[PDB]
Amino acid sequence: KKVVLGKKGDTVELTCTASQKKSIQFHWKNSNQIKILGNQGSVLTKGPSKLNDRADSRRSLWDQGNFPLIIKNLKIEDSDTYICEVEDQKEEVQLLVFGLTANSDTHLLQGQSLTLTLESPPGSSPSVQCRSPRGKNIQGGKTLSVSQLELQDSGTWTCTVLQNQKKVEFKIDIVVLA
């Protein structure tokens, strides 16, 4: 089930709702059944995983059958399928994380090319469609590139990466110097 699009460096929350006697025995594992974090009766316990000090939950929501997994300082290596098992219920969530660099430094001379690279997990070729304030939308795979930058390109651009019906939106501000 589920697909959540993360943006490199950011924080994310993967919801897990369940029926039960408001709050119960839960835990999140990854694909290799590595237990990421669960509840020792009433407290939060995180096992020895690469997500340890970035992985967290929100206990006050347990009483309302919600047991989110929160991963801060997102690395595209966090892209993986997470499982949330609350007592008898099991929920699957795939986290996909992307990066969108601006190879050519935002401040460039007019007539100069601009390249951007979308960082992705080893399992996805999304569609990146960026557009300049001049409305001219560009798209492509890993590398999006602009032939020559007009002075009317300076400022906040917007880039849409689409993956399995969902989308994240990177923004760039380009200082096209004359």
Do 32 and 93 sit in the same domain of this protein?
Answer: yes
Cα dihedral value 160, 94, 32, 24, nearest 10: 140
Do 87 and 103 sit in the same domain of this protein?
Answer: no
| Closest among 130, 138, 120 to 159, alpha carbons compared | 130
- Residue-number span of the structural domain to which 85 is assigned: 1-98
Taking residue 5's Cβ as centre, other Cβ atoms within 10 Å add up to: 21
Resolution (A): 2.7
Sign of CA dihedral 176, 6, 55, 57: positive
The b/e string for 74-105 (b: 16+ C-beta within 10 A; e otherwise) is bbbebbbebbbbbeeeebebbbbbbbbebebe
Do 85 and 58 sit in the same domain of this protein?
Answer: yes
CATH of the domain at 73: 2.60.40.10
Do 156 and 139 sit in the same domain of this protein?
Answer: yes
- The CA distance from 112 to 75, in Å, is 31
Contact 30, 80 (CB under 8 A): yes
- The CA distance from 158 to 129, in Å, is 8
- The CA distance from 113 to 117, in Å, is 14
11 occurs within a structural domain: yes
